[PDB]
Amino acid sequence: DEYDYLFKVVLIGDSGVGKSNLLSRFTRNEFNLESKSTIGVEFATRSIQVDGKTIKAQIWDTAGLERYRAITSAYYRGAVGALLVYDIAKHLTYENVERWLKELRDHADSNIVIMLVGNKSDLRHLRAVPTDEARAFAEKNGLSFIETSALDSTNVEAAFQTILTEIYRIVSQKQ
Amino acid sequence: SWLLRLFESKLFDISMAISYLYNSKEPGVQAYIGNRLFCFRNEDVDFYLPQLLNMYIHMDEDVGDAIKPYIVHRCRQSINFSLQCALLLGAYSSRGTKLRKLILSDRLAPEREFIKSLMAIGKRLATLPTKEQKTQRLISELSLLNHKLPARVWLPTAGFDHHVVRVPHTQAVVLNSKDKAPYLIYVEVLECENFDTTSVPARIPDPSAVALKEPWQEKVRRIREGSPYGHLPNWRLLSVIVKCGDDLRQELLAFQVLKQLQSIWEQERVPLWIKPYKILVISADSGMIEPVVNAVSIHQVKKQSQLSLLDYFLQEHGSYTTEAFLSAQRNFVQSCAGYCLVCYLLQVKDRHNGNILLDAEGHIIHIDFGFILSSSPSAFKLTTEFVDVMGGLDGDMFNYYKMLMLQGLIAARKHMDKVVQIVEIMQQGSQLPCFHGSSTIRNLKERFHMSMTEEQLQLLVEQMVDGSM
Ligand SMILES: Nc1nc2c(ncn2[C@@H]2O[C@H](COP(=O)(O)OP(=O)(O)OP(O)(O)=S)[C@@H](O)[C@H]2O)c(=O)[nH]1
Ligand SMILES: [Mg+2]
């Protein structure tokens, strides 16, 4: 039969933070160290089940580069979920998080669920962003927060199922 | 996922790590390896430090930024590592100037003043055209360094952390009568667990001070008995050759190749014998070399004893039927084959009896590995004398010598890339004469003959032996 819900979730963030690999690890449990730049958008999907209700998660990995930026702003439309991904080894990607927040609040819904993701946690010795600071920033702006690693699959499904169940909670409570 | 399966497999050592770091143009890979460097044992990465810093200096900033965190951390950990880094960065730059100055600025003052003092002393001996005059002024100059000791000063050519406390100036000697003459010195030090932890020892103020041509052990006993620090169980004696006017970079490369080939032959259970001596590059025109004890050049042997090498073997180790002569002959054969393979692979030129050393056991030890690979001033030869020592052309030991060469050659083939890598990475942006040709690496690769079978390698060894005579 039919799904109970079709959740639209977009992956946004600076180019190179590891969105495509987070997506590939969540949907196909695969990883590639030599992943090339995403051209426009990449589509993956996964059906989860929450509270007896079936929910198909349509996930769109958007391109971090400006080249396809406008095209990535058309996938903000109708999106109930958004993962703002940065790199813990590159501080600049953490700096642009606010900009991604602004753009997300410019081209998407105001009631969208935002999950702050700090990818590449396996690179312990290359860390440029402390967890406490990022958590503080996430809590200060009413965002979810989690540090992931697509390489060793740490907190990937945790992040996705977290934002998905949160979305389901928000949808159900408003009904 | 294959590559990730590889990087996390048991096959992933510092060698392959640096290989991929050198070849890959993927930022994720560079970052992964840059973080992975922290997971390797310090002594494993230390051997490849010159390659790493060379990559930092003469390659794109992605590689350099990938390597930089590890180098910074290690520099924060070890002051010796900081010194080595500053030296190698200075010597191989003609980018890392800022990093070098950052390392020097941090503490390193006593060490730099010490080294500069030694080099200054080395330079001041030019006004004396003789070995003995030079030696006299050397002892005089060194007699004025002990007043500045002890201090946060050490010899990087030692395999342990320590503080320099004394210098038996009377025991020092200049090695030749050339302009920038290298000089040998002995240094009394005190070994600690960690140099960065323990501070400097206190100072404590004509029987022993006579310089004789005695063995290393007797030198140690003599110097220690007359030393104010000698009663300490902490006390240990070191020895270094200071070269104030000698580029030792090619020597360092050759040292790495030697260590590698040694490791390979040990792994493949091939009884070849070589003796790599530590090299300390201080600049592009100066450095230090840890000498091999109880060993004198073949020339010095045939000059002091005035005998042929075989005669000297019969005088020093006994007649043909003695155990000592047989053992010494075995050592001679194995060392000869080993350094034959070394000279063939590295294309070592300027080979004479002034460069070939001889120790008490009967090993030969090639030194002064300048003019290798492409650079040429005269390669290694098999003189009648060496064959006479090995017992003749049709002898068992000569056949065993050739067979040792073949075995070591096959062993080298089975681990060729690990040797080629060392040279290939150092070639990057190098102004060294040993890279004068545009195809040094190609020729090096060709000298391994990977396309040949074992029979063809046998024929190759036969041709090589025939040609070297
Ligand atoms: N160590 C480690 N490396 C990662 C991780 N995730 C991604 N990478 C590496 O970072 C590089 C970039 O990852 P990638 O997934 O292509 O970023 P992206 O955000 O999708 O890039 P784009 O589509 O916005 S342009 C890749 O080479 C990948 O190997 C991770 O979790 N841990
Ligand atoms: Mg991508």
Author numbering:
A (entry chain F): 6 to 180
B (entry chain E): 128 to 221, 232 to 243, 306 to 404, 512 to 683, 691 to 782
From the paper:
In this article, we describe an application of hydrogen deuterium exchange mass spectrometry (HDX‐MS) to identify dynamic regions within type III phosphatidylinositol 4 kinase beta (PI4KIIIβ) in complex with the GTPase Rab11. All deletions were then combined into a single construct that contained two internal deletions, as well as removing the N‐terminus and the C‐terminus. This construct, referred to from now on as xtalPI4K (HsPI4KB S294A 121–784, Δ249–287, Δ408–507), enabled us to generate crystals of PI4KIIIβ in complex with Rab11.
The higher resolution crystals of the PI4KIIIβ bound to GTPγS‐Rab11 revealed novel molecular details of the PI4KIIIβ‐Rab11 interface. These crystals revealed formation of a helical element (residues 70–77) within switch 2 (residues 72–82) of Rab11 that was not present in structures of Rab11 GTPγS alone. To examine if this conformational change occurs in solution, we examined the H/D exchange information of Rab11 in the presence and absence of PI4KIIIβ, mapped on to the structure. Intriguingly, the combined crystallographic and dynamic information from HDX‐MS revealed conformational changes in the switch region of Rab11 upon PI4KIIIβ binding. Switch plasticity in Rab11 binding interactions has been noted for a number of Rab11 effector complexes, specifically in Rab11 bound to the motor protein myosin V,30 as well as in the complex of Rab11 with FIP3.42 This intriguing observation that PI4KIIIβ changes the conformation of the Rab11 switch regions both in solution and in the crystal structure, suggests that this may be a mechanism of how Rab11 could be biased toward binding specific effectors.
